[PDB]
A paper describes a structure:
[name] ([name]) is a human pathogen that delivers its genome to the host cell cytoplasm through endocytic low pH-activated membrane fusion mediated by class-II fusion proteins. [name], like all alphaviruses, is a membrane-enveloped, single-stranded, positive-sense RNA virus with an 11.8 kb genome. The E1 glycoprotein contains the hydrophobic fusion loop (FL) and mediates membrane fusion. Contrary to class-I fusion systems, [name] achieves membrane apposition by protrusion of extended E1-glycoprotein homotrimers into the target membrane.
Using sub-tomogram averaging, we elucidate features of the low pH-exposed virion, nucleocapsid and full-length E1-glycoprotein’s post-fusion structure. In the timepoints where membrane fusion has been completed and the intact NCs have been released into the liposome lumen, distinct protein densities decorate the exterior of fused liposomes. These protein subunits originate at the virus-liposome fusion interface and are distributed across the entire fused liposome. From top-down views of fused liposome surfaces in our tomograms, the protein subunits appear trimeric. The resolution of the averaged structure is 27.2 Å at 0.5 FSC (Fourier Shell Correlation) cutoff. Fitting the E1 ectodomain crystal structure into the density map shows that insertion of the E1 trimer into the outer membrane leaflet is only mediated by its FL without embedding additional regions of the ectodomain. Moreover, no extra density is left to accommodate the E2 protein. These observations indicate that during and after membrane fusion, the E2 proteins do not form any oligomeric conformations and likely remain as individual protein subunits diffused across the membrane surface. At the junction between the viral and target membranes, we observed clear examples of E1-homotrimers that measure ~100 Å, consistent with the size and shape of post-fusion E1 trimers.
Residue numbers in the entry:
A (entry chain A), B (entry chain C), C (entry chain B): 1 to 391
Amino acid sequence: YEHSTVMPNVVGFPYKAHIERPGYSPLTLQMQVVETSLEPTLNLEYITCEYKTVVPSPYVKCCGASECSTKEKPDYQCKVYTGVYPFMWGGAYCFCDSENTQLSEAYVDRSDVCRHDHASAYKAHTASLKAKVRVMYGNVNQTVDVYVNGDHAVTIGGTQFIFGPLSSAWTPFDNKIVVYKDEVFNQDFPPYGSGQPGRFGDIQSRTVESNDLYANTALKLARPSPGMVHVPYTQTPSGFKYWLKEKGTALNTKAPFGCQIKTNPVRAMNCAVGNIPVSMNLPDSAFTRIVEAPTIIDLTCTVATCTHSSDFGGVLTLTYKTNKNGDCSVHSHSNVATLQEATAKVKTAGKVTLHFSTASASPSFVVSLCSARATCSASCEPPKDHIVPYA
Amino acid sequence: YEHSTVMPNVVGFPYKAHIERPGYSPLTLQMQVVETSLEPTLNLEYITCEYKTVVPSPYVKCCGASECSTKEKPDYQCKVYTGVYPFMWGGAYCFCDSENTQLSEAYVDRSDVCRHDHASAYKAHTASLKAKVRVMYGNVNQTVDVYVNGDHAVTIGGTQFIFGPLSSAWTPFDNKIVVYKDEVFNQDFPPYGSGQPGRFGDIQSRTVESNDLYANTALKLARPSPGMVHVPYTQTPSGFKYWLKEKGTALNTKAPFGCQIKTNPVRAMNCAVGNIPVSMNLPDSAFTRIVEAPTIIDLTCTVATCTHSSDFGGVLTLTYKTNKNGDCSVHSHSNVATLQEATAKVKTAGKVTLHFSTASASPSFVVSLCSARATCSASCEPPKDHIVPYA
Amino acid sequence: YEHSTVMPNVVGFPYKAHIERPGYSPLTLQMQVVETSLEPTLNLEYITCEYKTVVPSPYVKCCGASECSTKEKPDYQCKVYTGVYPFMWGGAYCFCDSENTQLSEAYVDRSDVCRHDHASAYKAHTASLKAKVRVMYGNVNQTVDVYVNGDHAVTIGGTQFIFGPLSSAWTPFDNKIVVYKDEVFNQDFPPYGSGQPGRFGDIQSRTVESNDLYANTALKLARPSPGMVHVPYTQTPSGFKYWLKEKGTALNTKAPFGCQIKTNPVRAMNCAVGNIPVSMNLPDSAFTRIVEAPTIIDLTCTVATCTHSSDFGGVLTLTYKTNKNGDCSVHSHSNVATLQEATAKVKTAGKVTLHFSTASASPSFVVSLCSARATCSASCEPPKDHIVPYA
Ligand SMILES: *[C@@H]1O[C@H](CO[C@H]2O[C@@H](C)[C@@H](O)[C@@H](O)[C@@H]2O)[C@@H](O[C@@H]2O[C@H](CO)[C@@H](O[C@@H]3O[C@H](CO)[C@@H](O)[C@H](O[C@@H]4O[C@H](CO)[C@@H](O)[C@H](O)[C@@H]4O[C@@H]4O[C@H](CO)[C@@H](O)[C@H](O)[C@H]4NC(C)=O)[C@@H]3O)[C@H](O)[C@H]2NC(C)=O)[C@H](O)[C@H]1NC(C)=O
Ligand SMILES: *[C@@H]1O[C@H](CO)[C@@H](O[C@@H]2O[C@H](CO)[C@@H](O)[C@H](O)[C@H]2NC(C)=O)[C@H](O)[C@H]1NC(C)=O
Ligand SMILES: [Br-]
Ligand SMILES: [Br-]
Ligand SMILES: [Br-]
Ligand SMILES: [Ho]
Ligand SMILES: [Ho]
Ligand SMILES: [Ho]
Ligand SMILES: [Ho]
């Protein structure tokens, strides 16, 4: 005997069957997902951080003017200045035109702070997704691992179980991301040797200790000002600093489908998409599903704040009355609005907060809490102004 | 009793079971998908449109040397010259010993037409996918909603149904799109402050009414021409206009898997990918599936026009003979060619048009109509020439 | 009667049921996947290759100076050089005791070698995914095709089979790729008219025989050097050549989930993600699944070489003892490490090599071979240094 089924891939909402096998005492099977880990394969492209300008001591020369070649230094520059500031040794000896040539030069190197303050630009692709399912068969509790890259057969309670491959493997991570501290961003970060001044990627290197530093800060050598010889130049404030102010909110809180982002190994947790098929040694006869959901009534929607076209810029609040504290499912029956989370715990208190998203100022959608519906009407403000860069 | 099954996620091709429950009258269950809505979470990055050049009043100098600073306007440009020597003096105003001077300047602002003619660049990620399934149980017809972010239990006809989570949620939308009018494009549009002259994103601002206008039109101040003082300059014709001619065909007609694009709320409809699992209170004994497909013969393929390496640039036409007007499935058994639609209605007329795609000039694939096969042989022309920009 | 099930979408690991239909001789059903083809819809954006500089013969002129307009040529340039009149050579060339003029010009065109040595930049999106399943019903062997864009009903052995739509359609290809020879890369290649000098896309054209050549090699006209008239200029070595050295490893060996890349028609094979649901005319009573996996013990992990943050830069080697040569499944129970392949053949020899990936120098994960586990401890070196471009 082999009975096949399929449970939802959502952490929380359980599967509860009432296995009444003709012999005696009836078993109460119950398996639910408790975790979901989708780790991508980060392929570090490069890292960027505040830069540091470096200008060595200048070469004071006479009319015996020199000409600077070109070395291999990040954004390296050099300019021979003909005819600069009246001062001299001996009694103005040079002579031969120009009066005084100046060999000014300066290049770039990543700030001494990169080590403990830099962002990373990885190229990630979903590598594997596994989930932990806790099955409570009668008087036995066991946790099984389920993947996408293959099924998994296990024997629990003297019964054979086979948790077929997860239907799909959805990822909230794009193919190009940027990891800063504990934050993760989905940015189409400029390629390696393609950074632009005053913008993310101002300077670029494979790693902090790397030796392939690339920069493009628009370092421009200026002509010396009479008085005390020094090296004047124009640049463009650390794009990295600029990015810090620009870069919006992280994925950490904009992840769809209730997906939760984490940073150390970098992964998406409890992402709610799909189903997990199972099968056992029992006739579809002994099987009988149980569906006991918290009955709720007097639903009421109330939108506090809401922002126009921005990943979940709205905030809905549902008031209600329940008969039993539990865990309900939330949905939107209007394509004009989308819900971030896909579930919410229902407490007898009567307060549920959800984040929604829409691109229509003044939208009118209908949210749902289990089997109850309610309308939401709100007026949203357009997205914040950007932070204009060096104009 | 709980019997589990799974129907295809394609609008049209139905599921038909013959439930012969030993009791009396045999029931004829039939459930099929009728719609599919996958809405993404657009996160407006910026919008662009035809720009408008602006030139302030020219600083008609004379006996002075007014120098210019750096205003905060969009891509400000200021240059001061020493000419305009047609004459124009008089002496009573400028009895100077030195020659003339003139400070010309200009900046940019989005054309007065952006309001009702601009494109938008959103950053979208699949937010939710739901489908409408019409189940016709015996003498009862009911429509149920099914999602990915959770299952859904419903009671219909005194029988309990549970439409498990949709297998997967495929999206034809990339992570960076551009919405123009009723069209949608998959473009890796340049980032915010990174627009280039004569190219899409010439100018950029969060919103039309925004106040963070960014531009890079390569505005260059030219030296005045003797005669009537004015402000000469070089620029680069509105990249936006250029984009209009460049930007190929929209996704609206290149969407794979028969997916249909829509614009107001922005979503993909009837996308045909996946399956929808269900379960009821009935033994696998009373259940018996029915599969009555239109039998077709004398299949014949004929390729009219075909373009090389371009999203569905070919057009196949199948002639045939059917026994009953119905709805068949179309497939390609040769990796060298791919079919856009995944289904086609079979009329007794005998004419079916399909769009195919391949990257091989002179390909030889085998299309299929239900259970019938036929070969297709055609010779394709390479893709159209691009529209070279300001050379 | 209709019994539903679901088998894993992995080429190799089979499905084996023991159909004991009360009548007589027991049938041994066994169906397993043998291939998987996911072809995308490449939409050729443009191709690039080594460029060729072109400077025609110069126009030796007198003080009767000419002025060069502007033609339509790739990166076309021209500059009228005043008093650059090389001066002297034989007879009389411009007696005007002032200055003559030099009309120098040069443009670009793709090297004569593009035809048989160029890369291609396509814009690809999953078009269709089909799999070949070999079902061995009793004393009959038949191969059925299964897709995502629809189900498929077939009759084999006098029994009706319906292979529902594949759960999902995962693709290792991004939305922007580059095909070179037999290699495929996932590169966010610069758009059409947006190429940069000394970088991939130096020059760009829809096709090799195209007539929309675009270039941006930073061609700069230099002033002639006294002696033998010629045309001096500065450029930037073929970005294409640079790309050749830069472009890391191809997808061909970094494809996740054991996916295998191919080049002629361009597709991903045996990608191991998902499940394939089936159903027949038999009670869940006659059905009984069989799971006979090779029992292995004395597992031992040994990491040879390992590279930091790079798509599968590590190499694990498992030693062991088996009871029967077979085919096991490999997994990682530590989010800090991911396995490339999702299966491995188990020979009595005792040697299994796997590629893993992690972003943590000095990681400690636990790999698995069927039902056996083992720890892996290794220390990895950071990613190679990039290849700094024209500094
Ligand atoms: C099979 O799994 C069942 C359910 O597993 C759930 O586990 C949780 C943690 C989540 O993962 C869920 O998603 C899983 O479904 C097991 O049944 C559970 O059994 C435990 C204990 O009986 C229940 O947990 C308790 O719930 C009560 C509420 O009734 C809490 O008050 C209680 O809090 C504390 O727990 C710690 C343990 O870390 C105690 O040290 C602490 O003192 C306190 O316990 C309470 O102590 C006070 C005295 O101060 C006493 O008055 C309370 O009676 C005592 N509470 C109890 C009953 O523990 C804790 O969270 C859990 O609710 C049950 N699940 C349900 C709702 O069915 C089952 O045991 C597993 N089978 C086996 C044996 O493996
Ligand atoms: C369920 O849907 C069917 C359509 O498939 C409805 O049947 C239609 O009935 C009307 C009048 O009896 C006819 O004009 C149509 O041709 C029928 N369609 C077909 C093909 O059956 C049926 O009424 C619905 N069930 C309900 C709500 O009673
Ligand atoms: Br890149
Ligand atoms: Br962007
Ligand atoms: Br592009
Ligand atoms: Ho500025
Ligand atoms: Ho990009
Ligand atoms: Ho041009
Ligand atoms: Ho260089």
